[PDB]
Each structure stands twice: as structure tokens, then as C-alpha cells.
Amino acid sequence: MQLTHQLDLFPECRVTLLLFKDVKNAGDLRRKAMEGTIDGSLINPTVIVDPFQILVAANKAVHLYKLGKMKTRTLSTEIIFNLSPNNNISEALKKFGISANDTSILIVYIEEGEKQINQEYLISQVEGHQVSLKNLPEIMNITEVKKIYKLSSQEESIGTLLDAIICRMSTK
Amino acid sequence: MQLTHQLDLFPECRVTLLLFKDVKNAGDLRRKAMEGTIDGSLINPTVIVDPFQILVAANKAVHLYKLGKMKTRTLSTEIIFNLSPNNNISEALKKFGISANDTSILIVYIEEQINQEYLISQVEGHQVSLKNLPEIMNITEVKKIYKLSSQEESIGTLLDAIICRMSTKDVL
């Protein structure tokens, strides 16, 4: 059900994605994310075409973190911001973070060294139903994605799609 | 003249671009580059549509250099490698680096402090301004290497497509 990925550039870093459906407490999760009583980055899964898009965002996040050149104040926000087409942080977090009105949530987190996330506890904090990440394509909304990244109606493979999105995430 | 820029996340670093036309000793400047008796990345100017292209490649290289994560042996090679959309190192230096029978050369170098009027005296040719780059740049070559639509678009538009080609390379 979890998706786990060892960063090839930063081997000691592993990134985990967890997906939840039927979420009855998005309102509180958002507050916990905003007073930091919750691990990970809470990401609106409606606008994430493939976990691959999150892995690029996280890879860049870790990179600026290791350089000490994050554009945002923390690793968790930096992941979310990297998803955005543009330089507004306060708009980026609004659009790609969760809102109280989401019923589906994607959480993303990174571990290296001694710092290990209590996954079992994180899961228990979501009043929802954890689903496999293979479920993303039906929770995902292709019109929103295309709107947000200013993309062409002309349908394409997730691969072509991903390169267009990755490009809009690099140039902002 | 010369053009110079601050690096994105390291304002204490400068990229300098020097353009040269009517170069006689390209063959030797290439031998010396290797050897390391000349500073900088020696670059094919016929495939550069805008300095910005160089800036992206230099940023990207320095951000790996500062961690010792470069794909190539050295910073000068890394910059040239970053210009190519493909992974093969040796193929990227061949298209983007200089060859024995070139008569135009672009030198690119970073400081955090290289002189310069000796560097100029390395090149057995005339130093012209960078505004001069559009008139050497082989447009049908650019299209073949970056694989762009044939149908004629703006330098601005072509540049974006070029920035995307570089931006989708190795991402993970």
C-alpha cells in the first residue's frame, strides 16, 4: 500500500508516499500541518498525475536542503512548493497542500540516518481509509492538472505529460 | 566585450562568457583544455541560442559540484554536459564542446578569481561581443540536437523548448 523510493542521488534518503481515501478529518490534519503536530507533507492528490511527479519534487527538496539553499523554511513545505508552476509560496501551499474540503490525502515524507518516522502513528491520525498508490489515477483529475500547469488539451502518455509538468516545475 | 552573471543560489559566484570569432588554433585550445592549461568550458557557439542556456547549465553544475555529485570528471566538463539533452557524456562533449576545425569559440568560466586578458591571449582570434551570438548560431543544427518542431517559432519559444529539453534530462 505504501510507496517507498530510495533517492539515487542521495542514497541515504528514502521517500515514502501514503494515500488515503474517504477522509473525514481534513480540517484538523491541515491545522496539525499548520502547528506542526504531524509528520510529512500533506499534498492535494487531485493534482498529482503520478507518484513520479512527487519524487522529482522531493529530490529537488532534499538537494536544496543539503546545500542549505531551500526556498522555504522547511523540508515539508519545500516539497509542496516544488510542485508549483510559480514563485508564490503562499499560493503554492494553498493549491498543492490540502484544504479542509479534501476527502483524499497524500502524505509524503523523507528519512535519512537516525530520524525515522512513526508511520503506524501517522496512519492513525487520518480519519480515513489508506489505499494503495495504484489508486491515484482515479482520485487524480486531468482537467485540474492541465489548468494548473498551463498545458495542451492534446492528450498524451503519462510520460510526455510528466515531462511537460516537470518542466513547468523547473522553470517556475 | 564579456557578459557576466550571479549564480541563482550562490550570489558570491560569477559566470563569465567570452565569445571569439575567426579562431585559428581551436585544435590546440582543445588539447590544452584537457591538460588543464586553460580555464573554462570551451563551447560550440553555433548551438547556443541565448546565454540563458549557459546559465541554466552552470547553475545546475555548480549545485552538484558543491556536493561532489557531478556526472563528469570536472566543472568545465559538467557545464558542457548540461547543455546536451542526452545522457552519453562523450557524445555531449563532441556536439557541444569545441573541435579542431572550429573558427568560433565561446569560453565559459566560474569564480567565487580567473584572469582573463591572459585567457584572451590564449585564443589566436578577435574578441567580439555576445550580442553577436545570434549570427553564428546554426538554427537547423539546434533543431536536430534538441529535437524541436520544424515549423518556425520565436527564439523566445525555441529557447523555452530548449530549457525543457535540458530540464527533463536525468531527473532522477
Residue ranges per structural domain of chain A: 2-172
Beta-strand (E) ranges in B7-162?
14-21, 41-43, 104-111, 126-128
How many Å apart are CA B163 and CA B166, to the nearest integer?
5
| Strand A14-21 relative to strand B14-21, pairing | unpaired
Task: Identify the architecture of domain A2-172 in CATH.
Answer: 2-Layer Sandwich (3.30)
The C-alpha cell at B54 is 549557459
Residue of B nearest to A66 (CA): B67
Q: CA A39 → CA A20, A80, A115, B24, distances in Å? A: 15, 14, 11, 61
| Strand A129-131 relative to strand A14-21, pairing | antiparallel
How many Å apart are CA B41 and CA A136, to the nearest integer?
44
B38: which residues sit within 8 A by CB, 6+ positions away? B29, B32, B119, B122
Residue of B nearest to A71 (CA): B9
Is B63 in contact with A63 (Cβ distance < 8 A)? yes
Task: Give the 3-state secondary structure of residue B17.
Answer: strand
Task: Give the 3-state secondary structure of residue B124.
Answer: coil
Q: CA B4 → CA A65, A78, B66, distances in Å? A: 27, 30, 21
b/e burial code for range B120-140 (CB count within 10 A of at least 16 → b): eebbebeebebeebeebbeee
Long-range contacts of B140-144 (CB under 8 A, 24+ apart): B141/B46, B141/B47, B142/B47, B142/B49
How many Å apart are CA A158 and CA A145, to the nearest integer?
12
Neighbours of B78 (CB within 10 A): 21
Q: CA A130 → CA A19, A102, B100, B119, distances in Å? A: 6, 15, 61, 62
> Which residues in chain B are contacts of A14 at CB distance < 8 A?
none
Is A163 in contact with B163 (Cβ distance < 8 A)? no
Rounded to 5°, the CA angle A113-A115-A119 comes to: 125
b/e burial code for range A127-166 (CB count within 10 A of at least 16 → b): ebeebebebbeebbeeeebbebbebeeeeeeeeebbbbbb
Q: Which residue has the cell 535540458?
A: B166
Instruction: To the nearest 10°, report the CA torsion of A136, A142, A148, A149.
Output: 90
Q: Could you tell me how far CA B158 lies from the centroid of its own chain?
A: 17
**Ramachandran area for residue B36 (φ above 0: left; ψ -120 to 50: alpha; else beta):** left
How many Å apart are CA B168 and CA B86, to the nearest integer?
10
Provide φ and ψ at B86, rounded to 5°. -100, 165
Candidates B146, B164, B166, partner chain A, best to mutate (most A CBs within 10 A): B164
Resolution limit in angstroms? Answer: 2.5
How many Å apart are CA A92 and CA A79, to the nearest integer?
10
Neighbours of A63 (CB within 10 A): 20
How many Å apart are CA A170 and CA A59, to the nearest integer?
12
The C-alpha cell at A169 is 516545475
Please say whether the beta carbons of B53 and B166 come within 8 A. yes
Distance from CA of B30 to the nearest CA of A (A): 31
> Which of B41, B46, B25, B47 is CA-nearest to residue B147?
B47
Distance from CA of B150 to the nearest CA of A (A): 19
How many Å apart are CA B61 and CA B42, to the nearest integer?
15
Please say whether the beta carbons of A161 and A48 come within 8 A. no
- The partner residues of A41 in beta bridges, in order of sequence, read A108
Please say whether the beta carbons of A142 and A157 come within 8 A. no
Task: Give the 3-state secondary structure of residue A71.
Answer: coil
Please say whether the beta carbons of A61 and A78 come within 8 A. yes
Neighbours of A16 (CB within 10 A): 18
Distance from CA of B36 to the nearest CA of A (A): 28
> Which residues in chain A are contacts of B10 at CB distance < 8 A?
69
Helix A158-171 vs helix B155-167: crossing angle, to nearest 10: 110
Q: CA A69 → CA A77, A96, B63, B95, B113, distances in Å? A: 13, 21, 10, 33, 23
Chain B positions touching chain A (beta carbons under 8 Å): 9-10, 63, 66-67, 69, 160, 163-164, 167-168, 171-172
How many Å apart are CA B30 and CA B72, to the nearest integer?
17
B155: which residues sit within 8 A by CB, 6+ positions away? B49, B50, B134
How many distinct helices (H) and strands (E) make up chain B? 7, 5
Q: How far apart are the first and last CA of chain B?
A: 38
Task: State chain B's maximal CA–CA distance in angstroms.
Answer: 44
Neighbours of B154 (CB within 10 A): 8
Q: What is the helix (H) or strand (E) element at residue A65, kind and residue range?
A: helix A51-67
How many Å apart are CA B46 and CA A26, to the nearest integer?
54
The C-alpha cell at B21 is 570569432
| Strand A3-6 relative to strand A105-111, pairing | unpaired
Q: Which of A9, A67, A167 sits opposite B167 (nearest CB)?
A: A167
Residue of B nearest to A55 (CA): B172
How many Å apart are CA B130 and CA B3, to the nearest integer?
7
